[PDB]
Amino acid sequence: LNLDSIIGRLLEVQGSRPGKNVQLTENEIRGLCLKSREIFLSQPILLELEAPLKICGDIHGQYYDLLRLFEYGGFPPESNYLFLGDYVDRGKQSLETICLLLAYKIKYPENFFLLRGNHECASINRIYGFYDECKRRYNIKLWKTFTDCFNCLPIAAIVDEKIFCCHGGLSPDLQSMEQIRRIMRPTDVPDQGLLCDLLWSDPDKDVQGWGENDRGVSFTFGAEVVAKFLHKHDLDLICRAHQVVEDGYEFFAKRQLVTLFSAPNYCGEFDNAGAMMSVDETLMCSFQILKPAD
Amino acid sequence: XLXRXXX
Ligand SMILES: [Mn+2]
Ligand SMILES: [Mn+2]
Numbered sequence: 001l002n003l004d005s006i007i008g009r010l011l012e013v014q015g016s017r018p019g020k021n022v023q024l025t026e027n028e029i030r031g032l033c034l035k036s037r038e039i040f041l042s043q044p045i046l047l048e049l050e051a052p053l054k055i056c057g058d059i060h061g062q063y064y065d066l067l068r069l070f071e072y073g074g075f076p077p078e079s080n081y082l083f084l085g086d087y088v089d090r091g092k093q094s095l096e097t098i099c100l101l102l103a104y105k106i107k108y109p110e111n112f113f114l115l116r117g118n119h120e121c122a123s124i125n126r127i128y129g130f131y132d133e134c135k136r137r138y139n140i141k142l143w144k145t146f147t148d149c150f151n152c153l154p155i156a157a158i159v160d161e162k163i164f165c166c167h168g169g170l171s172p173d174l175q176s177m178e179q180i181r182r183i184m185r186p187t188d189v190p191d192q193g194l195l196c197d198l199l200w201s202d203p204d205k206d207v208q209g210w211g212e213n214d215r216g217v218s219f220t221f222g223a224e225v226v227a228k229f230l231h232k233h234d235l236d237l238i239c240r241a242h243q244v245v246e247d248g249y250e251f252f253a254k255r256q257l258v259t260l261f262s263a264p265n266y267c268g269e270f271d272n273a274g275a276m277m278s279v280d281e282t283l284m285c286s287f288q289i290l291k292p293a294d
Numbered sequence: 295x296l297x298r299x300x301x
Contacts, residue, residue, distance in 0.1 A: 090296070124299070127299065128299070214298050215299065215300060242300075243300065244300065267295070267296070267301030268295045268301050269295040269301050270301075
């Protein structure tokens with residue numbers, strides 16, 4: 001697998017013109033999937049990470065924005081990264097997006113990390129774009145290759161035993177971190193349960209405890225739930241993504257939880273910014289933002 | 295507003 005050649009070609013379009021494709025060969029993409037899948041299975045499903053590092057929320061195929069993020073935070077290995085999921089669907093270039101991320105995971109396996117988002121799931125892909133992108137630019141078999149790789153993505157990460165990170169949010173079934181560690185891979189995302197909640201739940205200012213989620217799956221949770229969770233697990237923060245927030249980032253429950261969304265100009269109801277959070281050695285937070293197209 | 299599966 002000529003990783004460096006793949007990376008050079010992916011990065012080659014930087015500055016060329018927003019929207020220009022990078023068409024890797026199916027064998028190259030297959031290689032990225034198989035090698036990264038191997039690494040994913042080899043590392044914990046619940047990642048134990050160290051700061052400083054940069055954390056990114058949803059990308060959703062906005063390849064040129066991913067490039068802007070790396071330009072801002074420093075292209076690997078200039079900085080450690082943790083992506084919270086949702087690499088595909090919606091955007092115009094999910095293929096280039098997921099391919100660069102998998103390439104960097106293989107390249108810097110101890111300094112680059114990717115968590116599973118609710119969109120790294122076959123059924124959702126069929127509806128939101130990735131399936132069609134793969135069918136058009138490659139073939140359906142390659143899409144299956146991607147899903148097998150997705151089925152092995154880690155589910156959560158804890159930065160220096162204080163910051164709990166996952167794509168969606170908390171789960172009413174999450175009593176112990178060992179429950180997460182017990183989750184076996186490969187696996188698809190179920191319709192209910194811990195794994196489902198970690199990839200689907202949302203915090204809710206108006207909810208007392210656990211509530212029903214308008215997404216038609218999982219739950220919503222209140223600030224008290226968060227406060228209780230951090231206390232019980234001796235954590236300081238919950239870092240998640242999943243929801244589109246106008247400023248690219250948004251704090252919840254007296255800054256006990258933060259939502260990160262890294263795809264700018266994604267929302268139809270509003271022009272959102274895309275944010276990337278820098279967590280320093282003392283676990284202090286700062287942001288690098290892609291402000292909406294003025 | 296994109297469609298709640300989610301703007
Ligand atoms: Mn999501
Ligand atoms: Mn998303």
